Amino acid sequence: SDVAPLSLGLETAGGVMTALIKRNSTIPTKQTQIFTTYSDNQPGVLIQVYEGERAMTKDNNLLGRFELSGIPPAPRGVPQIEVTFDIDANGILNVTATDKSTGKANKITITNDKGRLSKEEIERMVQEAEKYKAEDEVQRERVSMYRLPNVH
């Protein structure tokens, strides 16, 4: 089958690239993942869709953005935001985010138009990750470390 030429994911807290569909994954495909809030009573979540292999979204390519508001106040980590990345056989990417507390959903359709990447630009972004692989490895391992509470 065809494949995703670049990894696709979302920005998670701290400017982290969190991939839902990995580079060279077979397409069509869909991946569904549950996300939650960063702070108590957080009223909305920022959904920014990125493509690329680097560990931090500042270094990847923004494909689309939307906000989901109206989240009921709750302790951090309790709201459940269901995100689905859905790629068709032509590579067209639909992203849906749904607040399971109320059922309010938001969605974007990301097409394959003129501002998108060519084979050579795709190839260059692959090179970029390899050059920064060791540094990006440390960023990802940092994201994965458990956090300890403060003293006093």
Pick the piece of the chain touching its own copies (CB under 8 A) from 24-32, 45-53, 113-121, 123-131: 45-53
Other beta carbons within 10 Å of 69: 10
Q: State which H helix or E strand residue 144 sits in.
A: helix 133-144
**Residue whose entry in the numeric block shows the structure tokens 């920022």:** 46
Could you tell me the smallest distance in angstroms from the CB atom of residue 46 to its own copies? 5
Of 124 and 142, the one with the shorter C-beta distance to its own copies is: 142
| 13 contacts: CB under 8 Å, gap ≥ 6 | 38
DSSP-derived letter for residue 13 is T
Q: Would you count residue 34 as binding its own copies (CB under 8 A)?
A: yes
**Residues in CB range of 137: below 8 A, 6 or more apart:** 55
Query: Nearer to its own copies by C-beta: 78 or 92?
Result: 78
Residue 77 as a binder of its own copies (CB under 8 A): the answer is yes
> Contact positions toward its own copies, by CB under 8 A?
10-14, 16, 18, 33-39, 42-48, 67-69, 76-78, 80-81, 142-143, 145-152
